[PDB]
Amino acid sequence: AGSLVVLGSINADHILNLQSFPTPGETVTGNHYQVAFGGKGANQAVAAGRSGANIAFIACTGDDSIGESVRQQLATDNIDITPVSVIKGESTGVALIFVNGEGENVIGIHAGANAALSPALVEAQRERIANASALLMQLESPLESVMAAAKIAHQNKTIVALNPAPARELPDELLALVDIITPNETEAEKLTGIRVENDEDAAKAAQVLHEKGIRTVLITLGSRGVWASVNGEGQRVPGFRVQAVDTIAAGDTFNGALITALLEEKPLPEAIRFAHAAAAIAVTRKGAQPSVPWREEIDAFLDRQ
Amino acid sequence: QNAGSLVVLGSINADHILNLQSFPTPGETVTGNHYQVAFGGKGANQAVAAGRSGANIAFIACTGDDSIGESVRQQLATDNIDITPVSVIKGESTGVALIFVNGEGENVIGIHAGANAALSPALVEAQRERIANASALLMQLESPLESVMAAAKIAHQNKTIVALNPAPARELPDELLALVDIITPNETEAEKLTGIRVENDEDAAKAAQVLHEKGIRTVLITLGSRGVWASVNGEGQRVPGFRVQAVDTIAAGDTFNGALITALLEEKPLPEAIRFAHAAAAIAVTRKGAQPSVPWREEIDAFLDRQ
Ligand SMILES: Nc1ncnc2c1ncn2[C@@H]1O[C@H](COP(=O)(O)OP(=O)(O)CP(=O)(O)O)[C@@H](O)[C@H]1O
Ligand SMILES: Nc1ncnc2c1ncn2[C@@H]1O[C@H](COP(=O)(O)OP(=O)(O)CP(=O)(O)O)[C@@H](O)[C@H]1O
Ligand SMILES: OC[C@H]1O[C@H](O)[C@H](O)[C@@H]1O
Ligand SMILES: OC[C@H]1O[C@H](O)[C@H](O)[C@@H]1O
Ligand SMILES: [Cs+]
Ligand SMILES: [Cs+]
């Protein structure tokens, strides 16, 4: 099948489950603590890899021991880590995550080596990006780097897939180069200025994105699935119903598995189905990367449906 | 000529500290500007402030059997602390704290108790002779309530001074408050224990009175920058700190508490003792991290005599 390049961050996630988020000056004690591999780019690369994509990963670790471990792990996740650079004198990214009794989380991130993923590292991968069928990125990498790689993909008819997370505003210049974008509700509001409270809102935020030049807009709607729109023709694809347990990286899982399905030439709806399945398994498991399902598991889930 | 012996009982953590502009909002993700891993824990911080400050101090505590646990034990030994009564709990990891510090320097902390949770009444009871023979016992609320109470009762029956730093904030039973001789709440803890909001010295007087009536002779409610309200059996008095430029106030109270007990064991009167503690903490607030920000006695004297 087609060839995927993911470009994004790598973190070590520290996750503490608690009842309520601490308020300023406060101290709370948690009930479960976990250390695992995270980072939006790595989570997405792992969802692609484990889903069965031909994927290569552009990213940076620091020169430390954790960076060493994550590289070895990534290689076992069906990912070509040849373009994963090692930044001398730099530490591997870290995320500190609190998850409350509802399942809401807040996240603090130490960028470390992720900030060292520069336009010049992108340019060194020109050829790789020019030959890929698709390029998938998020916003935990330097914007200038996302922009440089989007330009190369566009020049070379590589599908640009952008998951605009974490939330922030983005220039028209970037948005015009994107073919598929996957905002959640907060992002869609941040990018279009339209608050997304229902399917009719979803279709409105989508329209503003189609006029920015983006043909395929998917607005994830949490447990309400996704609003999928292709130049203005839109419908909701409900997700599967499961006993959720951990939502971190659900969207990561969804993006990685979406692109995998699309590059197998499955049509959008079959592909969203594939993806919704993968995420639903993911929300029944703990942590980010440990939660990411394998193809066989995603295929066994769909048969059971 | 050594002062009376001090026993510190409480927690030990590895601190993961991320400076950023604004605390993350729900569903939000923010990138910070600085990250640091350091030794922490309220009990360890206080043990180190007392040790560096010159006390004769022994530390009752539990680490896990991981590498961080061994590293913290080695480091504590070099801080003039007797670590003999620091237990290695097999099968557990050392405590961990995740900390965000915002642009002003307000902080938020989530803690995974790990081995700290193993500090049981059986373990305290094994230190019975030690608590009974010490001149003072300093504790906080990062250790299981049952254990703080067992320690307080041993100390009380042997006229070992019980000094309690009631942090993190929570409600305590009368049964414990009756055994305390010196308490050091901040304005938030004072409120949680008395029900009285503390915004000024007058409020502090009221809050102290409730604590005094609960049985606590010496009540020191810290007022951040404004200093401290010191009260003994209802006789209150304000004692200002020093003014300095703040970068990081993690472990400020801890420093205060540790050097406070040290100077009182040196028989310095309360006013001067508090002034010595103020001086330690004021230095501490100009340095990052917790234990790494705690000053040595040499530096405290130099700073006091300077200005
Ligand atoms: N509770 C739930 N039950 C079943 N599926 C769920 C689910 N919550 C999320 N999903 C699936 O995961 C996808 C992403 O959900 P969501 O809108 O919450 O992404 P997100 O912004 O939280 C993502 P991420 O954290 O990786 O960015 C949804 O499209 C849906 O398929
Ligand atoms: N901004 C500041 N400038 C100078 N000294 C300060 C200071 N903030 C705190 N201190 C020192 O620390 C002592 C206690 O401060 P504070 O009331 O903030 O403790 P706290 O319980 O709120 C936090 P913590 O115990 O973690 O420091 C003060 O008496 C003072 O000695
Ligand atoms: O999407 C979840 C991820 O975001 C943050 O990047 C964490 O590292 C976590 O793995
Ligand atoms: O008082 C600051 C300390 O309290 C918390 O317990 C952290 O460990 C930190 O070192
Ligand atoms: Cs998960
Ligand atoms: Cs400090």
Which CATH number characterizes residue A26's domain?
3.40.1190.20
What residues pair up with A58 in beta bridges, in sequence order?
A7
Closest C-alpha among B225, B292, B281, B221 to residue B256: B281
Strands B81-82 and B13-19: unpaired
Enter the tokens of residue A153.
């993909």
> In the structure encoding, which two tokens stand for residue A210, read together?
């189609």
Partnered with residue B88 across adjacent β-strands are: B63
CB of B276 closer than 8 Å to CB of B209: no
Q: Which two tokens stand for residue A4?
A: 């995927």
Distance, CA of A279 to CA of A256 (rounded, Å): 10
Contact: B108, A26; criterion CB under 8 Å: yes
Distance CA A278, CA A294 (A): 8
What tokens were used for A283?
């929300």
| Residue corresponding to tokens 């000024």 | B200
Strand, coil or helix: what is A242? Answer: coil
| Cα gap A296→A51, rounded to integer Å | 8
Please give the Cα distance from B169 to B165 (Å, whole number).
10
* A161: its two tokens: 């897939």
Residues of B in contact with A138 (CB under 8 A): none
**B77 CB within 6 A, ligand 2:** no
Among the bound ligands, the one closest to the CA of A252: 1
Ligand 1 pocket by Cβ (under 6 Å): A 165, 184, 220, 222-223, 225-226, 239-240, 242, 244, 247-252, 254, 276, 279-280, 283
What resolution in angstroms does the PDB record give?
2.3
Q: In terms of residue numbers, what domain contains B220?
A: 1-307
Please tell me the distance between residue A65's alpha carbon and the centre of ligand 2 in angstroms. Answer: 37
Tell me, using a 6 A CB cutoff, whether residue A201 lines ligand 3. no
> Which residue on chain A is closest to B109 by alpha carbon?
A27
- Rounded Cα–Cα distance for residues B299 and B255 (Å): 13
Q: Which residues 6+ apart lie within 8 Å of A198 measured at CB?
A: none
Decide: B224 in ligand 2 pocket, CB within 6 A.
yes
Token digits of residue A265: 């030439």
Way it was determined: X-ray
The one-letter amino acid code at B128 reads: R
The reply to whether residue A96 touches residue B100, judged by beta carbons under 8 angstroms, is: yes
Return d(Cα B264, Cα B84) in angstroms, integer.
24
Q: Please, which residues have CB within 8 angstroms of residue B158's CB and are 6 or more apart in sequence?
A: B131, B132, B133
Q: How many domains does chain B have?
A: 1
Residues B263, B270: Cα–Cα separation, whole Å: 9
Ligand nearest to the CA of A279: 1
- Ligand 3 pocket test: which of A11, A70, A292 has the largest number of ligand atoms within 8 Å of its C-beta? A11
d(CA A96, CA A21): 13
Q: Which residue in B has a C-alpha nearest to residue A14's C-alpha?
A: B98
Q: Which helix (H) or strand (E) holds B60?
A: strand B57-63
Closest ligand 2 atom, CA of B188?
22
Rg (CA), chain A: 18
A228 and A254 in contact (C-beta within 8 Å)? no
Residues 6+ apart with CB under 8 A from B274: B220, B228, B230, B239, B260
Substitution candidate for ligand 4 out of B8, B11, B15, B141 with most atoms within 8 A of CB: B15
**CA of residue A95 to ligand 3 center, whole Å:** 7
Separation of A169 CA from ligand 5 center, angstroms? Answer: 27
The values of phi and psi at residue A25, to 5°, are 80, -5
Cα B103–Cα B108–Cα B110 angle in degrees, nearest 5: 145
Do residues B281 and B208 make contact, with C-beta atoms less than 8 angstroms apart?
no
> What residues of chain B lie within 8 A of the CB of A25, using their CB?
106-108, 188
- Helix or strand holding residue B268 (H, E): none
Q: Tokens representing B62?
A: 């539990």
Name which of B15, B23, B112 to mutate to probe chain A: the one with the most chain A Cβ atoms within 10 A of its Cβ. B112
Largest Cα–Cα distance in chain B? 58
Write out the binding residues of A for ATP.
184, 220-225, 251-252, 276
